[PDB]
Paper text:
CSDaV is a positive-sense, single-stranded RNA virus that belongs to the genus Marafivirus in the family Tymoviridae and has a monopartite genome of about 6.8 Kb. In brief, CSDaV encodes for three quasi-equivalent CPs that share amino acid (aa) sequences at the C-terminus but differ from each other at the N-terminus. The whole capsid models of the two types of particles are almost indistinguishable and reveals a T = 3 icosahedral symmetry that gives particles with a diameter of about 30 nm. Each subunit of the asymmetric unit has typical Jelly Roll folds which consist of eight antiparallel beta sheets.
Besides the expression of free/non-fused heterologous proteins, we also demonstrated that the CSDaV infectious clone can be modified to incorporate heterologous protein into assembled virion capsids, just as it has been demonstrated for other plant virus-based vectors. This was demonstrated by fusing the GFP coding sequence to that for CPp21 in the full-length CSDaV infectious clone to generate the construct CS-GFPdupCS, referring to the fact that the GFP-coding sequence was inserted between two identical protease cleavage sites (CS) in frame with CPp21. When western blot analysis (using antibodies against both the GFP and CPp21 proteins) was performed on partially purified virions from the CS-GFPdupCS-infiltrated leaves, the free/cleaved GFP was not detected, but both fused GFP-CPp21 and free CPp21 proteins remained detectable, suggesting that the GFP-CPp21 fusion protein was incorporated into the CS-GFPdupCS-derived virions. Transmission electron microscopy (TEM) of the purified virions confirmed the production/assembly of ∼ 30 nm icosahedral virions that resemble WT-CSDaV virions. However, northern blot analysis indicated that CS-GFPdupCS virions likely encapsidate the recombinant sgRNA (∼ 1.5 Kb) but not the recombinant genomic RNA (∼ 7.5 Kb), while WT-CSDaV virions show encapsidation of both genomic (∼ 6.8 Kb) and subgenomic RNAs (∼ 0.8 Kb). However, in this experiment, only approximately 22.5% of the screened CS-GFPdupCS particles were gold-labelled, indicating that the GFP-CPp21 fusion protein may not be abundantly incorporated into all of the particles and/or the GFP is not always displayed on the outside of the particles’ surface. In attempts to reveal where (if in the inside or outside) GFP is displayed on the GFP-recombinant CSDaV virions (CS-GFPdupCS), we have determined the cryo-EM structures of both the WT- and the CS-GFPdupCS-derived virions. In total, 175,869 and 12,732 particles were used for structure reconstruction of WT and CS-GFPdupCS virions, respectively, yielding density maps at a resolution of 3.1 Å for WT and 3.4 Å for CS-GFPdupCS virus.
Residue numbers in the entry:
A (entry chain B), C (entry chain B), E (entry chain B): 21 to 195
B (entry chain C): 23 to 196
D (entry chain A), F (entry chain A): 24 to 196
Amino acid sequence: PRLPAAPRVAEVGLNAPSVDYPFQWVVASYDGSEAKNLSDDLSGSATLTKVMANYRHAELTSVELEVCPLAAAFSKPISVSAVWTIASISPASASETSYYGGRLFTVGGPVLMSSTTHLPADLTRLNPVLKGPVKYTDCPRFSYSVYSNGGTKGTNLCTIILRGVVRLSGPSGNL
Amino acid sequence: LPAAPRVAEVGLNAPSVDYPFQWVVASYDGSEAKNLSDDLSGSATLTKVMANYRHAELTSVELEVCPLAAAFSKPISVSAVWTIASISPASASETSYYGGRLFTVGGPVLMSSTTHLPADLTRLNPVLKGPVKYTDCPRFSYSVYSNGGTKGTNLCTIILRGVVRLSGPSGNLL
Amino acid sequence: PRLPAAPRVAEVGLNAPSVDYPFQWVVASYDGSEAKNLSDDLSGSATLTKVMANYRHAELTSVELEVCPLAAAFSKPISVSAVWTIASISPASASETSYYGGRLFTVGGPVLMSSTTHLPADLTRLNPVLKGPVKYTDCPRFSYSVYSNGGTKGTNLCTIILRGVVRLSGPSGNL
Amino acid sequence: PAAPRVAEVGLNAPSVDYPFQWVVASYDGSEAKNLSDDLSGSATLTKVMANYRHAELTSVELEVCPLAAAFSKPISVSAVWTIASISPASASETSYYGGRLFTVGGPVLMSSTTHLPADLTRLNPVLKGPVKYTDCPRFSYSVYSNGGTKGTNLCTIILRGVVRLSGPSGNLL
Amino acid sequence: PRLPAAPRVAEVGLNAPSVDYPFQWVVASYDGSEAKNLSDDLSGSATLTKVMANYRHAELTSVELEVCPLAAAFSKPISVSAVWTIASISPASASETSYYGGRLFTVGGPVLMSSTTHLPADLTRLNPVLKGPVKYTDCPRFSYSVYSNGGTKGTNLCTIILRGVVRLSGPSGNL
Amino acid sequence: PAAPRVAEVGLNAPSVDYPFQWVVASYDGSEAKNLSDDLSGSATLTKVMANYRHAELTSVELEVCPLAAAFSKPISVSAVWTIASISPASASETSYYGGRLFTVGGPVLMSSTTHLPADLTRLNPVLKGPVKYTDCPRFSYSVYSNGGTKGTNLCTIILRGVVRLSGPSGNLL
């Protein structure tokens, strides 16, 4: 799904020295005990905020949400509906298939490893910049919902992890 | 489908914006067989989207029968067809019309693009709203066969997504 | 009678495979018992509708109304006034000579066969298309009236029959 | 061009401009009265357009002419020109773009601002044709409840404009 | 399987206006209650006969027999043996694997959708013409047999449907 | 150019002009009522702009339409279009440039001078964008205390204009 292009701000510079910072952290681990929703804006992510707390500029080069199955999900698949939107749009709970590009993955079964449940962000349409001189309103936001399937409260059927690369530029001299 | 003659539209350079849309039609469990045939020109969600524009023509539409986790151990069968708005298929008889498909979603293969049915806008009519009321507008008709559902499992879900080009906004109520 | 030209819709295509379908059916048989009127739009004619019920496009190439006399009309001619109009205009009963091109035929007498009582349709001015993507409002409509001349209720002085050719294109896959 | 339109070949036909004007209705303040009409099938205009195959609006406007009886009692009517597809409800004509609320009468019977002209660049000028267009002009107006005397008729609504008629048909004389 | 070429009649014309008529109808629905055989010649198929009842010429351009599985066949596959022969050859019941090109499909199991159970007709070797000036004896004939696997008389394990395209030419003026 | 603006690359995107009109509020003379709203986050316009990423005003105006009940009792409202940064206080709308004092009703309900159009050459036309602009149009009007009957609603404030919407987003259908 390719969203139509929209006018965007122009940023001069982009020639300052900068380092690509690869980050990855498990978003959460989910079972089938209850349906659980989580929507997060990458501008205000706590771990990502503390990654770029000392730099003036920080823009994403790639980011993707990974729905990794576990062994306990071999005989009990679990369903997760996920979407990447702009920060302005805030999807509701369990209603991420109503937004264009929202996909409903089902992890488990005989195929315990597959790249069909990793949802990437189309940074050409979203806003790569997370921290800058001005606060942007169309930064990527990931919203997902996990449907209950009678889990036993501890098996942790699936794990949602988020990884990517953020380019950090222009450190500010504060301590 | 064989070609048919069609009317012509003059101004294709009018300011138009491509409007991607997606909305879940309904979630079905195999407790009872359920039919649904809808013309895209009169579907409630699409028409509340495009009631504010004078012209609205599709670029690509595709109905999707996405399996859920509960359908892993209990597949469900749906027969679907994309036809002309003049033709209204009956219940459970979507295989009697040319191009009708009989999808069966579920099982260990929980994800596959083989159950995605796209509309043939080359032969159908992309235009849903315009100066005239066409009769070749696409109609999607599907029937879900009962297989012993639990009335709460929601084995499958029906997702209709695509792109509609809207042009000439109207001074409507909102 | 040649009506002045009026602007008409433009239809692209017309290159799809199509078959000329020759049709002919007796419209009715009339005697002099009572004056009888009949006006019919060729778009909604039942026999013609079932001819083109499986095709997307159906346009006339020629059509004419034939007032054929019978033997019983040899010594008792009968009068029929007929007109071809657009579907918007609906002639009244026995008032088809007030519309431009309406003609009053008298069939019978020593000349029992003549082509002067066959009224053709000027499809250059009317709309040849009967079935298409859009419903047209100026398709041919034939309106005629039969005047009573003291018939004996069963002799069937004249027979009105309609024949023509309709080109059918773009079959639709329905059964 | 705001929106695409259906192609019409052979538009260079002999056509005549036909100015028309007719009073829509006279309204008093006894009760609120709504009226919405599509110019495609207006009863008192089709008689003008019955003799021709093509009718295309060049200009059209809705006029709210006050009467002298409205001097001591103003009357308010809300009107809008819209697409024939859109059918505004009663007293909701100010919620659509171009919808006005003409109040007439009052101390001075001179305000010539009661004209409500149709924006044919955002509408479909064609009223009659081979097909039945769905975006022809439609006028919708609602008259609010004044303290009317049930007989005064202290407001007048009229329609005037120009329609270009082409391709006459062999109709009744 | 490609049958060797055989001499065939020559037909002049083939330039008359003609429309491709796409047809599709479910042949039947079968379960495992009992073994059921069906052999049908496409020249005399009732639905196909009424499709081309008003045309002088009608020749196939493509046709295939589809063995579509159902949900109830997920845990209970069903076996169908099918063959396309000439109208002269009439296969017996449950003996379609003895004829060259006869294939034994098994529909069901974890793979509920596959194009390996759709058997097409080699119209280069068979006779595309179904209706013409003369009656041909080598028109396509489809013969299939469904083996019983202890079905419960109502589950309808599989559905056999037949779809194709027939070109219709030279309508005859009859009503 | 009155003042510098933020650069916006890729402005040649497919855009559609979206005329909008909605009645702001109906006011009686019972008590003085102030209302100042920024078009960047107006509740009844964001629903139009929620489905698109960029929204740029082409024209906008504030209209004070009198009602018939104002014939015998005029009502005065002071309004101004200003920078969203500036937030004029109550009854101080005539102290800013372009602030008008529309009095409506009176002997004649015909004065069409109640239009207050925004000067977009001195403002920021953009209502929605990647950033949150601080100089978008903001309309501020205060209605003074008449001798109202607390139910008459003898004045109406409406907003109409055109917004160019570009870059639709995959929002709800």
